[PDB]
């Protein structure tokens, strides 16, 4: 797909890249990591035993209101079956757009933000169930 890329972990590192880019790269059991390559309403249409979905926002420079509403729906619906959706690598600008479009109307959703993918992975290790 051009709109998302599935990432894996280079074993025994904090490096996450395209699962197809290198043979020894492996997905982490229980976690799906998707790099967003196009506005999320696109990647979402493709989407349509996992405890955590990590969305890598490193390539995202801004979000529009349609995208934030789409993301909010993704977070809510996974959440409703107990799966956390983490947002990794959001720029200050992206978090500003999220905020403007009322993504953090419930301030608890700030806990879904992490600076790096590895930070998100570690954050999924132990948390309220
Ligand atoms: Br977006």
Curated annotation (Swiss-Prot):
Q: List the induction conditions.
A: Up-regulated in cochlea by thyroid hormone T3, perhaps acting via thyroid hormone receptor (at protein level).
Q: What subcellular compartments does it reside in? A: Lateral cell membrane
Q: In which tissues is it expressed?
A: Specifically expressed in outer hair cells of cochleae (at protein level). Not detected in other cells of the organ of Corti.
Q: Which domain of life is it from?
A: Eukaryota
Region Extended region for STAS domain, as annotated, extends over 1-129
Complex and partners: Homodimer. Interacts (via STAS domain) with CALM; this interaction is calcium-dependent and the STAS domain interacts with only one lobe of CALM which is an elongated conformation. Interacts with MYH1.
User: What is stated as this protein's family in its record?
Assistant: Belongs to the SLC26A/SulP transporter (TC 2.A.53) family.
Purpose:
Voltage-sensitive motor protein that drives outer hair cell (OHC) electromotility (eM) and participates in sound amplification in the hearing organ. Converts changes in the transmembrane electric potential into mechanical displacements resulting in the coupling of its expansion to movement of a charged voltage sensor across the lipid membrane. The nature of the voltage sensor is not completely clear, and two models compete.
What UniProt notes about the protein's domains is: The STAS domain mediates dimerization, with both STAS domains latched onto each other in a domain-swapped manner. The N-terminus domain is involved in dimerization such that each N-terminus domain embraces both STAS domains. The STAS domain harbors a unique anion-binding site important for the fine regulation of the high-frequency electromotile properties. The transmembrane domain consists of 14 transmembrane segments organized a 7(+)7 inverted repeat architecture that can be divided into two main helix bundles, the ''core'' domain and the ''gate'' domain.
Q: What else is known?
A: The anion-binding site that controls electromotility and associated charge movement in mammalian corresponds to the central binding site of the anion translocation pathway in non-mammalian.
Name of this protein: Prestin
Organism field: Rattus norvegicus
Q: What is the lineage of its organism?
A: Eukaryota, Metazoa, Chordata, Craniata, Vertebrata
**Full protein: residues contained:** 505 to 718 of 744
């Amino acid at each position: 797909s051009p709109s998302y890329t599935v990432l894996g972990q280079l074993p025994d590192t904090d490096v996450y890249i395209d699962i197809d880019a290198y043979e020894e790269v492996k997905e982490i059991p229980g976690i799906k990591i998707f790099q967003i390559n196009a506005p999320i309403y696109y990647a979402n249409s493709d989407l349509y035993n996992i405890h955590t979905v990590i969305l890598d926002f490193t390539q995202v420079n801004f979000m529009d209101s349609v995208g934030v509403k789409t993301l909010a729906g993704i977070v809510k619906e996974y959440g409703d079956v107990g799966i956390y959706v983490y947002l990794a690598g959001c720029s200050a600008q992206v978090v500003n757009d999220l905020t403007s479009n009322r993504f953090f109307e419930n301030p608890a959703l700030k806990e879904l933000l992490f600076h790096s993918i590895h930070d998100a992975v570690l954050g999924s290790q132990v948390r309220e169930a």
